[PDB]
Design a binder for this molecule. Structure first.
Ligand SMILES: Nc1ncnc2c1ncn2[C@@H]1O[C@H](COP(=O)(O)OP(=O)(O)O)[C@@H](O)[C@H]1O
Ligand SMILES: Nc1ncnc2c1ncn2[C@@H]1O[C@H](COP(=O)(O)OP(=O)(O)O)[C@@H](O)[C@H]1O
Ligand SMILES: Nc1ncnc2c1ncn2[C@@H]1O[C@H](COP(=O)(O)OP(=O)(O)O)[C@@H](O)[C@H]1O
Ligand SMILES: [Mg+2]
Ligand SMILES: [Mg+2]
Ligand SMILES: [Mg+2]
Lengths: 359, 165, 359, 165, 359
């Protein structure tokens, strides 16, 4: 019975290999008073404590707080002893090799796992869609990555990173909801706005046409009930919030949208494989769950690519947790039990064993 | 803060309920599904109420719905602490979480309600890792399955103990 | 002879272009029985009526009551017919474009002004200090804004809003004056406490050192005579009330103080202009009139900024009405008479003319 | 935007200062090293402040340090626009650049500071090609040679007006 | 008084003949909104405009934008009228003959220069080192050239071009600085990274030995202060960034390093002159200014060349602007005044006069 832990920039997905869904999905935050709270405990206190993301943009920056999250994952969320289960970890693209060895050292020495394995998140999402070649647009909480993959290997020189994901969209929705007279500023009210975003926001196919439709009627207005029973109404903010994914200038960013970032990373690959990448663009992550985002990406990339290229955007219905689900299917295979890094192999080669067993 | 301490028998039972160890299917049937805590005779410790517990092996055999038979164990005119291991399912995950239940019925004597309420925040600090708390002050606030499901995950909860709401 | 109207969140400043001070300064409130009273009329009745702020946080939320205030401004306060004078209006930062057009429509159709102009309040305050680049900390009655401005244009992605100003400080002073045995609860007693706040309160440079000085002697105690001749004495409440500007936790707020809000909005600007913003922090509004607030802001921001940055807090002596005074100087210029939006231009382009003539 | 226009006398002086024409050493001595601009009496135009200028022929004779005598021309309680032709040297080039200087002292009246600040971005758009701008709001921000050198090229500037910093 | 303009792929060097250094060094970019900004003006706006290099790889591709840069050079940077001064222009190796005539036509018809001259950049660098025979390794901003020269004439069949220079090293340093947790993505932050590169980066003599030294201590770590006072620390990125000059696979390029490109162009020359080229390898350009690059080139070419050849790498201390300095010395000679292409000669022969007067 192996454990699968998907360490996201904002959300930790953990569960057991062989299950269809992760058992625990909690915020990857550590809170300390303005003495240490992890996950939903750090959000239950709200404003007394200051919150820190130890893996804010997919890359672990604070290894002391990252061990607190992994300890919280094993004992409080999964409710198991990590010394009895092999653990499959996931890593962001362009993760430095010193971080891969640091993860292997912490798992074998701090938690004493019998076996261990590290996988790349984008490759698991592409395999879960039934592909070995393609480009994965993984938009999560803290970071967005466009990862072109050829024959199961990510092309590292063509991987592009965009510091624009769901966390920035939640803050932008809080900002534009104040234009209607509502006030969402506190930490507890940010969790309400995140729930509004995940239920009522959508991507408009034509933004300027949708802004005219919303200004001439009320067919796009939705009501939302707050935890205390108060009802708010939201109008054009439903499609203005995820529009910042395609127009980052709404947030004051100079960067390109997710469609141009996907196009730019395809243009950094060999000319001979670009035709395959245009037809195998796979969406992944929680921020790709807006209704209408695949049709918008299809239209935007078609306008950037040559007219003779076939643009196909793949948005599988289970793409929110496709990294975790791909890892749990892989870790539950009887043929995969030879791929683990054993503690015996770690005692001989040290933490550098991860580079030859997990690539 | 009444200064009432938590006995080591309660701490051992909680540690065994929280973290599941790899065990034979026989020891899995001996895991506790629910357990009640009460005051000792001298009212100095929180102890295990003897005989008031549900085992995982009982669920599916002698026990059809574990939450209904758990509510029956609660006394009508006395306060109690409870630990319930809830197996529920949301729209995107199957969850298994411990629920701390403070049972303080209005019919209970004033002395029991005062001691259990003033010592609740001290026992809950010793039981680290519990993220769900249900304060029930009447039989109508605890008997309904949808009351527990609301505390677990609100409207996202679609199933409880393997049965749809 | 143009009119200059500064629509504040709690106070309306109105007067004639070319004058040194506004002629009328009255509360921007509309009172209705618990049939419609505006301004000081709504406060003369005290407790019979319920009071509403139509522009509570700088943004107009009730346009029917906002027209009552503008009608009261022209006929009862300025005592002129608005169809004979061009009117310069001011607007809060991050004012939505639908509100700018609504103001233009009301001025040309309801009041029939011959000409009209809309200006941003923070930009007028920065110009009045002799600057085109800087960050304006505008603390008024209902709202506090930190508005970084580069070359005469406010940077909208870096503008921060704080719902903590003089109105919250008046309520907090009423609350802590009851700890001395006084009772200020009614509407008439709130106007007394506001007068106590504007005369006896000050910002302590070191709060904990000032609390020790007040607890060991009576050199900080002041007497105040009530309207009925009764004399009250106030001690450490003099500096505890404006201390909530720097420690909003005194009010139960999770937000940052005005010093951290100023620092956070500088950090949202381009790194190349942050050095200029550190040296050009300009205070504006009635809530920045406490003695000792510029020295406290200087000390607090110095502790947040790098030690190599030069922190300079600008507190001009006329900063209470610097928005209105800047507008009256601008509207009285003969060269400015080409900048007005005429009624002829409005009949052709409609209310959208304000976006290209006033930006 | 106050609508204050730039007079043709200022545009002619700026065009003569920017581009240097091949001229006899006598006309080279008549080139302007620094020049002040002010508002007209009716406050409708930016005009040349008469008599407030430094000529290139004066530098090295009556004028020892051109930037020190330029700072002396600035009024203590009035706003002014200035055009200074800075001759400085970095680590790898000897440069000669025009610097636009906005002088708005805190002691100046509120009416002057408002009109000069609200009309600054319009005069600077007419003086195309200026790449350096110095906004000075007190005498301490303009009098120091290292303040100008920081605006010209930061720490790369090793000399200013032929003298090391 | 002649003008010397060195049109670089990324930087324009301009000045007066007879001076020791160019007066103006500005980016050769034209910016247009996402109406036309040239040089530092195009970089002062940062993210509003899109930037284009009209001479991106040494060869002018957009002649309309190239005239904007030359107009900006004469009037805004050099502050002279081009109709009063003869102008010496420089050109990249393998510049097509249509471009030489286009330059001559623009200088005589658009700018009305009295005289004009075109020189090859690599030949000026070799002359400045006191040589007429040798191979010039000119690494600039957009392009690297290895130009073998025999008796003052570049051998065009042996000239090799490498699209790998300082611009690619700046982008690579931005990429690997994000592995330490820093974020440099915007245009203003790219100018900061370029300043970090020119101050703290160096070429390691043994790369793998230097990577071990940096991983065992902190003697190679340097601090750098950002424009807003924040201090960052850089470690092995100091020598990993210029290491891409010798291992272009760090950038995902299939090409050879600058040492193998130099060796390959020597092997394309006559066997009888290769011994002279091995002993007269001259470095030129801004990208050859890394400390330790001459000793690394010496070691790398020694391993490629036969052991009986004497490898001598010439790195003159003024090699950054050796093209411009060589041109200003040449254009200031009284004997050179007979070499100019006069406007009289241009009116008779047309733009094809440049082929017989400047070769
Ligand atoms: N159903 C949804 N619709 C739109 N956005 C969503 C939805 N669900 C999650 N999001 C956003 O997706 C983000 C987290 O998704 P995730 O892929 O787990 O990121 P990460 O792996 O980096 O932690 C959150 O910001 C969340 O708000
Ligand atoms: N002299 C003062 N000292 C301290 N606080 C003051 C002083 N004067 C006014 N305040 C407060 O300033 C607030 C109103 O100032 P103002 O800038 O006009 O706000 P607004 O523009 O939002 O209406 C009021 O709450 C008032 O009590
Ligand atoms: N001192 C330095 N050290 C290392 N690299 C430098 C240094 N100076 C410049 N560079 C780089 O050299 C490049 C420009 O040099 P240059 O020879 O003028 O190129 P070009 O002629 O093609 O415009 C720039 O990318 C710059 O960053
Ligand atoms: Mg993710
Ligand atoms: Mg105000
Ligand atoms: Mg060059």
């Amino acid at each position: 019975a192996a454990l699968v832990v998907d360490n996201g920039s904002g959300m930790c997905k953990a569960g057991f290999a062989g299950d269809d869904a992760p058992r625990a999905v909690f915020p990857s935050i550590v809170g300390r008073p303005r003495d240490s709270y992890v996950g939903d405990e750090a959000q239950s206190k709200r404003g007394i404590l200051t919150l820190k993301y130890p893996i804010e943009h997919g890359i672990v920056t604070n290894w002391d707080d990252m061990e607190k999250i992994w300890h919280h994952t094993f004992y409080n969320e999964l409710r198991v002893a990590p010394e009895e289960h092999p653990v499959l970890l996931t890593e962001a693209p362009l993760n430095p090799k010193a971080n891969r060895e640091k993860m292997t050292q912490i798992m074998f020495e701090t938690f004493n796992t019998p076996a261990m394995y590290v996988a790349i998140q984008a490759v698991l999402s592409l395999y879960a869609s039934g592909r070995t070649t393609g480009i994965v647009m993984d938009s999560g909480d803290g970071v967005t990555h466009t990862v072109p993959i050829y024959e199961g290997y990510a092309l590292p020189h063509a991987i592009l990173r965009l510091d624009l994901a769901g966390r920035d969209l939640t803050d932008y929705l809080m900002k534009i909801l104040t234009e209607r007279g509502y006030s969402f500023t506190t930490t507890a009210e940010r969790e309400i706005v995140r729930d509004i975003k995940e239920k009522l926001c959508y991507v408009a196919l034509d933004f300027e046409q949708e802004m005219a439709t919303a200004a001439s009627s009320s067919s796009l207005e939705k009501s939302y009930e707050l935890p205390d029973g108060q009802v708010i109404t939201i109008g054009n903010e439903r499609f203005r919030c995820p529009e910042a994914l395609f127009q980052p200038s709404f947030l004051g960013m100079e960067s390109a949208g997710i469609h141009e970032t996907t196009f730019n990373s395809i243009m950094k690959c060999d000319v001979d494989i670009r035709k395959d990448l245009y037809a195998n663009t796979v969406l992944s992550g929680g921020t790709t769950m807006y209704p209408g985002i695949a049709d918008r990406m299809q239209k935007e990339i078609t306008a950037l690519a040559p007219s003779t290229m076939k643009i196909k955007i793949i948005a599988p219905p289970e793409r929110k947790y496709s990294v975790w689900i791909g890892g749990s299917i892989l870790a539950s295979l009887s043929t995969f039990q030879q791929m683990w890094i054993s503690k015996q192999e770690y005692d001989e080669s040290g933490p550098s064993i991860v580079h030859r067993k997990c690539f | 803060a009444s200064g009432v301490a938590v006995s080591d028998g309660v701490i051992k039972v909680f540690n065994d309920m929280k973290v599941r160890k790899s065990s034979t299917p026989e020891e899995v049937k001996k895991r506790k599904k629910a357990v009640l805590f009460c005051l000792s005779e001298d009212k100095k410790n929180i102890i295990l109420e003897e005989g008031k517990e549900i085992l995982v092996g009982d669920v599916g055999q002698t026990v059809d719905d574990p939450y209904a038979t758990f509510v029956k164990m609660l006394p009508d005119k006395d306060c109690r602490y409870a630990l319930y291991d809830a197996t529920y399912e949301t729209k995107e995950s199957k969850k298994e979480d411990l629920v701390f239940i403070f049972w303080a019925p209005e019919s209970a004597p004033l002395k029991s309600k005062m001691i259990y309420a003033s010592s609740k925040d001290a026992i809950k600090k010793k039981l680290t890792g519990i993220k769900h708390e249900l304060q029930a002050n009447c039989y109508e606030e605890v008997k309904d399955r949808c009351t527990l499901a609301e505390k677990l995950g609100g409207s996202a909860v679609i199933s409880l103990e393997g049965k749809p709401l």
